[PDB]
Amino acid sequence: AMVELSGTVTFWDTSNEAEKATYQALAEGFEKEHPKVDVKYVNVPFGEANAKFKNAAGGNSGAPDVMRTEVAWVADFASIGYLAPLDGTPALDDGSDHLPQAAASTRYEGKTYAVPQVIDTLALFYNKELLTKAGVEVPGSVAELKTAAAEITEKTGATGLYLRGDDPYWFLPYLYGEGGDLVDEKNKTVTVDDEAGVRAYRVIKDLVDSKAAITDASDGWNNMQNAFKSGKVAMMVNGPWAIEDVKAGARFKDAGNLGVAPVPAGSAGQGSPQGGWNLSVYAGSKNLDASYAFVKYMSSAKVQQQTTEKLSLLPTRTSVYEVPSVADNEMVKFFKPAVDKAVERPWIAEGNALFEPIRLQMANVLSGETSPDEAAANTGDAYRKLLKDYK
């Protein structure tokens, strides 16, 4: 005789209205192989979950055993002592299968505080009919995009690209395209203001000045979706969360008119920012052993496969992409090449705080107030102020 896992595992899930029934069933499925564990599923709106978790942990009461953690939230929560370390625990038993970026997002200062669940990124969406009418290939770089945009405008009147100007996550493809990045964690050095960062601010302004792209200082989500759905532009950069809305658009009655490609390269690189979700164990959990097993189960190939089949979320396990029903999934077909271009975030406590300086400076570049060099300098200065021990 051996004892079985027992006790309670409270799981806080942040999945949306359409996803939560499936995720509750998957979570409760843990009880099939562990009937003495009581899984208590709770859905927490994603935009409320970070604060709710911090408040419960900080009050030493009512915190879940297992928390669904956005990729940036791993370092956020670990940096304030709220996550159990998972190295040398049974939680990590499924190991090298994960996409490297997804694995990396689970680590904070040399320890593992999560297991990967799903990944996403930004990608270049394109109107196939407008590109076909114009005679152009999907552009693979900013230089190619400028040329393609001019052909699209001449032939069809549409602008090539809607460049999202009011949300800093959409700056990152341009930064990565110039071979740049926000910080060098290893050397505790701010890098957003090196020449690659200056060039990235220059690229976005050039795209608009040259008429390859249009943008807006406000309401950028709606403006971008309306422009792309209507054919005012032929291209936009966006994520999986946009697909259903695009399919409701007037130029996409035939979903076969939508193409998705990786974001374009810049002069010295190519990459798109990384999103997604992991699973973490609360540091103060009274049921660590069952929680380790629960996150292993929810991160497992079997569960990742079911998640894609039911919800079309993108797996982190390389093996799962070889499952026929996964390989032919609409979202996997649209996004896997883009996911191969994902670039890791800086996995630091202040990762999310790095976005606001970009938002402000990119806005000021696009309105003409601030030059690329001053924008990059301002971004770097704000980072040095936020990151007191970085050079």
Side-chain angles (χ1 to χ4, degrees), residues 189-245:
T189 304
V190 168
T191 55
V192 76
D193 55 357
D194 66 15
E195 277 303 324
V198 174
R199 288 194 305 271
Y201 285 114
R202 191 174 295 119
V203 163
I204 67 174
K205 189 52 166 168
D206 173 71
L207 281 170
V208 179
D209 281 347
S210 68
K211 304 181 293 164
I214 53 171
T215 192
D216 292 279
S218 297
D219 201 23
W221 175 259
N222 288 133
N223 281 137
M224 178 165 59
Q225 294 300 100
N226 292 342
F228 184 79
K229 287 163 67 181
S230 68
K232 185 175 185 177
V233 300
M235 297 181 279
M236 66 172 173
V237 171
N238 218 328
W241 54 84
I243 291 288
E244 290 302 308
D245 186 44

Side-chain angles (χ1 to χ4, degrees), residues 126-129 228-229 243 246-259 330 334:
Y126 58 97
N127 184 141
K128 290 181 180 202
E129 185 268 340
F228 184 79
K229 287 163 67 181
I243 291 288
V246 165
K247 289 185 190 170
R251 281 182 186 261
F252 302 91
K253 287 175 307 189
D254 181 356
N257 196 42
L258 178 61
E330 181 175 70
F334 281 139

Side-chain angles (χ1 to χ4, degrees), residues 108-109 182-185 187-192 346-355 357 379-391:
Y108 175 67
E109 297 190 337
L182 302 179
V183 300
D184 183 345
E185 313 181 46
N187 295 112
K188 288 202 286 284
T189 304
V190 168
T191 55
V192 76
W347 306 119
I348 64 174
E350 303 91 344
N352 272 345
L354 301 182
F355 284 107
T379 309
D381 286 353
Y383 286 12
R384 293 182 186 89
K385 284 174 164 75
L386 284 167
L387 308 167
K388 296 189 213 165
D389 62 353
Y390 277 55
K391 265 106 164 301

Side-chain angles (χ1 to χ4, degrees), residues 169-363:
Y169 197 62
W170 276 253
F171 180 69
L172 298 176
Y174 301 108
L175 181 63
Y176 301 146
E178 294 310 303
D181 213 333
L182 302 179
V183 300
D184 183 345
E185 313 181 46
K186 186 176 270 290
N187 295 112
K188 288 202 286 284
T189 304
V190 168
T191 55
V192 76
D193 55 357
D194 66 15
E195 277 303 324
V198 174
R199 288 194 305 271
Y201 285 114
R202 191 174 295 119
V203 163
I204 67 174
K205 189 52 166 168
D206 173 71
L207 281 170
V208 179
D209 281 347
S210 68
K211 304 181 293 164
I214 53 171
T215 192
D216 292 279
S218 297
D219 201 23
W221 175 259
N222 288 133
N223 281 137
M224 178 165 59
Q225 294 300 100
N226 292 342
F228 184 79
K229 287 163 67 181
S230 68
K232 185 175 185 177
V233 300
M235 297 181 279
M236 66 172 173
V237 171
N238 218 328
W241 54 84
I243 291 288
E244 290 302 308
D245 186 44
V246 165
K247 289 185 190 170
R251 281 182 186 261
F252 302 91
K253 287 175 307 189
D254 181 356
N257 196 42
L258 178 61
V260 180
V263 299
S267 77
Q270 186 173 192
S272 48
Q274 179 185 349
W277 294 89
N278 295 332
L279 303 139
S280 298
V281 176
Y282 167 51
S285 173
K286 299 303 191 192
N287 200 353
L288 289 168
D289 293 327
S291 300
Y292 296 151
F294 182 81
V295 305
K296 171 184 179 182
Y297 164 77
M298 292 295 283
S299 185
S300 70
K302 183 184 176 178
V303 173
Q304 293 206 191
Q305 176 184 333
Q306 294 175 288
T307 300
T308 302
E309 290 168 338
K310 299 170 182 213
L311 302 178
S312 296
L313 296 173
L314 305 168
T316 64
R317 283 181 175 277
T318 64
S319 66
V320 176
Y321 286 95
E322 290 182 355
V323 177
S325 54
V326 173
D328 70 9
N329 175 276
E330 181 175 70
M331 197 72 79
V332 169
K333 291 180 298 182
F334 281 139
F335 282 87
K336 189 48 161 55
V339 165
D340 286 347
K341 285 300 176 283
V343 174
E344 292 177 32
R345 307 277 189 102
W347 306 119
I348 64 174
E350 303 91 344
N352 272 345
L354 301 182
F355 284 107
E356 174 73 354
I358 295 174
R359 183 197 63 76
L360 181 57
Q361 302 310 314
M362 168 177 39

